[PDB]
Specification:
It is classed as transcription. This is part of a larger assembly, with chains A (about 90 residues) and B (about 140 residues). Chain A has about 90 residues and is mainly alpha-helical. Chain A contains two helices and two strands; from the N terminus they run αββα. Chain A has a two-stranded antiparallel ribbon. A five-stranded mixed β-sheet of chain B has the order 1-5-4-3-2. In chain B, strand 3 and strand 4 form a beta hairpin. Chain B is elongated, with a radius of gyration of 22 Å. The chains are: A mainly alpha (about 90), B alpha+beta (about 140). Chains A and B meet through helix 1, strand 1 and helix 2 of A and helix 3 of B.
């Protein structure tokens, strides 16, 4: 086998086929009729945030909040890791 | 200064669309009294009133991006605005899955690569704001419980 004419011709024909395929689908006036699920991250876990604030008068309540959204997790942690290095 | 014009598409029920089309192609200011648009402070709800008959409206987001293109000679076309919203008359509900043209239907479900759309980061900002109400936090990678 080689790649002087074989590679070039293969690329050319795939190009004509995709060009032909897109023209047809796009110009179609046919009516149309009305994915892998990722785990809660690679590590498959959640982020929890217990806390501590002072209420009016005198009080010391602590709030534990759990974030199960792996998107919120990533953005949250990235700031701490940055602020941990920001010192 | 100049502010970019904001064009959107208005979709009406078919009989009301025929009356509005006849009144537009007629061209009198009689249409101005007949057709009104009231947009509610939700931002995604409205009334379109055709001939003083109220219709319920929703401003939805379109899956593709349209662009209005004007011309003077029909050979060179100048882009005037970007259209991404439609006030159909009769959140997840405010997202339209289909496109305006006939070949584009269920485009969002079938002809769109599922890299992502958007929400997660506004929630992150809220979480950081709450975090700054803390002196001690406890976090544990967890399992089924």
């Amino acid at each position: 086998r080689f790649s002087v004419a074989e590679h070039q011709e293969r690329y050319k024909e795939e190009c004509q086929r995709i060009f032909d395929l897109q023209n047809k689908v796009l110009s179609s006036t046919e009516v149309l009729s009305t994915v892998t699920s990722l785990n809660s991250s690679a590590t498959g876990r959640c982020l929890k945030i217990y806390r501590t604030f002072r209420d009016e008068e005198g009080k010391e309540y602590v709030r534990c909040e759990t974030v199960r959204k792996p998107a919120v997790i990533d953005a949250y942690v990235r700031i701490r890791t940055t602020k941990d290095e920001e010192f | 200064p100049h502010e970019l014009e904001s064009q959107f598409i208005l979709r009406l029920p078919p009989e009301y669309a025929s009356t509005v089309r006849r009144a537009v192609q007629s061209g009198h200011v009689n249409l101005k009294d007949r057709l009104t648009i009231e947009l509610h402070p939700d931002g995604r709800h409205g009334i379109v009133r055709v001939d003083r008959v109220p219709l319920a409206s929703k401003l939805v987001d379109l899956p593709c991006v349209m662009e209005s293109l004007k011309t003077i000679d029909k050979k060179t076309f100048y882009k005037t605005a970007d259209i991404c919203q439609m006030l159909v008359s009769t959140e997840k509900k405010f997202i339209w899955n289909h496109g305006i043209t006939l070949p584009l239907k269920n485009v969002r479900k079938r002809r769109f690569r599922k890299t992502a759309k958007k929400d997660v980061e506004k929630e992150v900002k809220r979480l950081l704001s709450t975090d700054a109400e803390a002196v001690s936090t406890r976090w544990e990678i967890i399992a089924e419980d």
